């Protein structure tokens, strides 16, 4: 189950753009200390920090690779590399939030 994973992870996620062009774009992502850090395309720009206490993971109904991360002012649309990395990301995000709640 979720205990097959820890509460930290460094990797990449596909993040869907929006507007005239909606495409998947690879971004460096990391989870640590209850925070999801999402890098921008430009690598010297300060990354977005999402407090996982006030976010909700919504796995995809269908494809076992896509998931949303609902934050207070935005929904991020993510896609993992495959089934197994999807399970890893969602498990780590979950674990991180649970740990953060214990400590709050
Ligand atoms: C018009 C001139 C300005 C310009 O550069 O316009 C040309 C752009 C192509 O640019 P892009 O590289 O696709 O830009 C990305 C998207 O806006 C994406 O939605 C955004 O994520 P988010 O902000 O929604 O999450 C990314 O931010 P980070 O992920 O890095 O934060 C951002 O890098 O559009 C076109 O292809 C033209 C037709 C629309």
From Swiss-Prot:
Domain of life of the native organism: Eukaryota
Subcellular location field: Cytoplasm; Membrane; Golgi apparatus; Golgi apparatus, trans-Golgi network
Tissue specificity comment: Expressed in all tissues examined but a most abundant expression was found in the testis, brain, lung and spleen. A heightened expression was seen in the adipose tissue from obese (ob) and diabetic (db) animals.
Domain PH: 6-98
Post-translational changes noted in the entry: Phosphorylated on tyrosine residues by SRC.
Function, in words: May function as a signal transduction protein involved in the differentiation of fibroblasts into adipocytes and possibly other cell types. Possesses phosphatidylinositol 4,5-bisphosphate-dependent GTPase-activating protein activity for ARF1 (ADP ribosylation factor 1) and ARF5 and a lesser activity towards ARF6. May coordinate membrane trafficking with cell growth or actin cytoskeleton remodeling by binding to both SRC and PIP2.
Free-text comment on this protein's domains from its UniProt entry: The PH domain most probably contributes to the phosphoinositide-dependent regulation of ADP ribosylation factors.
Quaternary organization: Homodimer. Interacts with SRC and CRK. Interacts with RAB11FIP3. Interacts with PTK2B/PYK2. Interacts with REPS2; the interaction is direct. Forms a complex containing RAB11A, ASAP1, RAB3IP, RAP11FIP3 and ARF4; the complex promotes preciliary trafficking; the complex binds to RHO in photoreceptor cells and promotes RHO ciliary transport.
Protein name, per record: Arf-GAP with SH3 domain, ANK repeat and PH domain-containing protein 1
Organism of this sequence: Mus musculus
Species lineage: Eukaryota, Metazoa, Chordata, Craniata, Vertebrata
Range within the parent protein: 334 to 437 of 1147
């Amino acid at each position: 189950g979720n205990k097959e994973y820890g509460s930290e992870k460094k990797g990449f996620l596909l993040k869907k753009s929006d507007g005239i062009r909606k495409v998947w774009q690879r971004r460096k992502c990391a989870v640590k200390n209850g925070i999801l850090t999402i890098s921008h395309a430009t690598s010297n720009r300060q990354p977005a920090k999402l407090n996982l206490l006030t976010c909700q993971v919504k796995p995809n109904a269908e494809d076992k690779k896509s998931f949303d991360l609902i934050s207070h002012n935005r929904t991020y649309h993510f896609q993992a590399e495959d089934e197994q990395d999807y399970i890893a990301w969602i498990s780590v995000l979950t674990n991180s939030k649970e740990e953060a709640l214990t400590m709050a």
